[PDB]
Amino acid sequence: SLALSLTADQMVSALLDAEPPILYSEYDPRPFSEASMMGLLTNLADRELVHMINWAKRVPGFVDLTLHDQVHLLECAWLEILMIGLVWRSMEHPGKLLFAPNLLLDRNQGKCVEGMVEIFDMLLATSSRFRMMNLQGEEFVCLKSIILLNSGVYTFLKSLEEKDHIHRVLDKITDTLIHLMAKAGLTLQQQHQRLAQLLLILSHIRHMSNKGMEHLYSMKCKNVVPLSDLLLEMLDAHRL
Amino acid sequence: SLALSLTADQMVSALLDAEPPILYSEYDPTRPFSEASMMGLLTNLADRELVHMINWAKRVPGFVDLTLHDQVHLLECAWLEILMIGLVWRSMEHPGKLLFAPNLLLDRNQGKCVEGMVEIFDMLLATSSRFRMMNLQGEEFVCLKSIILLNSGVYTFEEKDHIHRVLDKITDTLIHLMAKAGLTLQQQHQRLAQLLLILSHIRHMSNKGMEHLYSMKCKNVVPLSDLLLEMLDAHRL
Amino acid sequence: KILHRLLQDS
Amino acid sequence: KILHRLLQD
Ligand SMILES: C[C@]12CC=C(c3cc(F)c(O)cc3F)C[C@H]1CC[C@@H]2O
Ligand SMILES: C[C@]12CC=C(c3cc(F)c(O)cc3F)C[C@H]1CC[C@@H]2O
């Protein structure tokens, strides 16, 4: 009831200021074991989850939703949001994943954990794609907010009031993306093409999350890593 | 490439012409549904559709310009997505029901017959309601289905640059269609976004469907055709 | 759920 | 592969 009043510049400003902090890892740069690396990654993810929730409530229109629907959106999208963040900060590091400023991992270190190098390859490919497109920070925060609102909306009485509100905010972010591109001097045809290019990447990000959810579940059942209660509940929501 | 020299109207016509037919199911009304028989019907149908999909893909502008290895990869990656968006499309005018075939129209309660399938049905039905709420047009649908074919597996790979040029053409085509339909400039990029974001849900349904199909196979519920076994194996679950 | 508590506590 | 074979003529 207020996010609709935001201008394109104000949407960007609100999103930029809502950005979560970049966290460090406990990593003592002692060599990796398989359990060691999974520990670092999951510990990091768990701490990031806490900040993600603060961020989500600062995403324009999110607090207007019921507490139930906020839970559903975050449960659905949390790994997607973690991954696009990872991919974004890894953009200027070709062939490397910047989980934290003190935890920069190349592809072959994905092999430390069974079945993780396939996940790394997908993440790196996405980062390479962002780098190819020269993805801007302002575009990035728009994309991440889109993921939060869109990923779980299809799996939702006056429930339509929530859905229509979410879609109305989604259109606003689309307007914001286009605004950024027009401001960058892109022609009308180039704006529509770039918009499409950015959104189709979200299809691959969804794919990576689904794959990552399965991998994380497999590592869980084997108990190579003790997952936090919060992380376990987020994983449980996808009921694999 | 001749695909890039195609106009928007030429893109639409080619895609509409390449549209595969609506096949029938082996549905036998003389016997009640079992988990096995229903899975048998659906996988039998998917198998026959796959043959049509392969030949359809070869008629998608720019696709045959790719190596056989890249064609294989794209189809292996997107085949279930493509089956699902087709199902969702022909289910549009049937609220609460999925039209797998003209003789196989199923609701969510019939999905309960197979363990864990009603969850898939619900997602498919929700997508169908979304397309119906958006009043998705046939011309838009064939653009979306072709986008899925080219895009879904492109990030798992210049061959990549050729694919992106074609994808841009389809974007131009979608915009062209919306403008021709009278949508304002703002409405155009808004609708474009709405349509493409649904592809994220379709990708999601595919991943879930792949795991469910794999689950049925590994419990010997249903014998999958050699083609289906290969398409499924490509995802390495 | 923990997510419930976190969303209420800001 | 069947798919590879089917993608030919
Ligand atoms: C350890 C995994 C790989 C990366 C993960 C991961 C962790 C993070 F902190 C982060 O900011 C992003 C991530 F993508 C979590 C798991 C998902 C699938 C793998 O199990
Ligand atoms: C049998 C499944 C449900 C529907 C499927 C399916 C079959 C088709 F012919 C079709 O045109 C569309 C489909 F979506 C295939 C499997 C994916 C997940 C389930 O196992």
Give chain B's domains with CATH numbers.
1-237 (1.10.565.10)
Q: CA A64 to CA A165: how far, in whole Å?
A: 9
Q: CA B25 to CA B19: how far, in whole Å?
A: 19
Q: Both tokens of residue A174?
A: 């689309």
Count Cβ atoms below 10 Å from residue A94 Cβ, excluding itself: 11
CA-based R_g, chain C, Å: 5
What is the DSSP pairing of strand B98-101 with strand A103-106? unpaired
Residues 69 to 88 of A: which have CB under 8 A from any C CB? 70-71, 74-75
Q: Both tokens of residue A19?
A: 């950005």
Cβ neighbours for B28, distance < 8 A, ≥ 6 positions apart: none
Mutate to test the interface with A, among B130, B204, B211 (most CBs of A within 10 A): B204
Helix and strand counts by DSSP (H, E) for chain C: 1, 0
Query: Minimal Cα distance from C4: which residue of A?
Result: A71
Q: Using an 8 Å CB-CB cutoff, list residues of chain C that contact chain A.
A: 1-4, 6-8, 10
Q: Hey, whose CA ends up nearest to atom 5 of ligand 2?
A: B42
Tell me if there are at least 3 CB pairs under 8 Å linking chains B and A: yes
Cβ neighbours for B30, distance < 8 A, ≥ 6 positions apart: none
User: 3-state DSSP call for residue A99?
Assistant: strand
Q: CA B11 to CA B16: how far, in whole Å?
A: 9
Q: Both tokens of residue A201?
A: 């990447």
A17/C contact by beta carbon, under 8 A: no
Closest CA to A133 of A182, A82, A181, A81: A181
Closest CA to B192 of B176, B175, B214: B175
Count Cβ atoms below 10 Å from residue B107 Cβ, excluding itself: 15
What is B148-170 written as a DSSP string? HHHHTTGGG--HHHHHHHHHHHH
A14/C contact by beta carbon, under 8 A: no
Q: Treating both helix axes as pointing N-terminal to C-terminal, what angle do B226-233 and B35-57 enclose, rounded to 10 degrees? A: 80
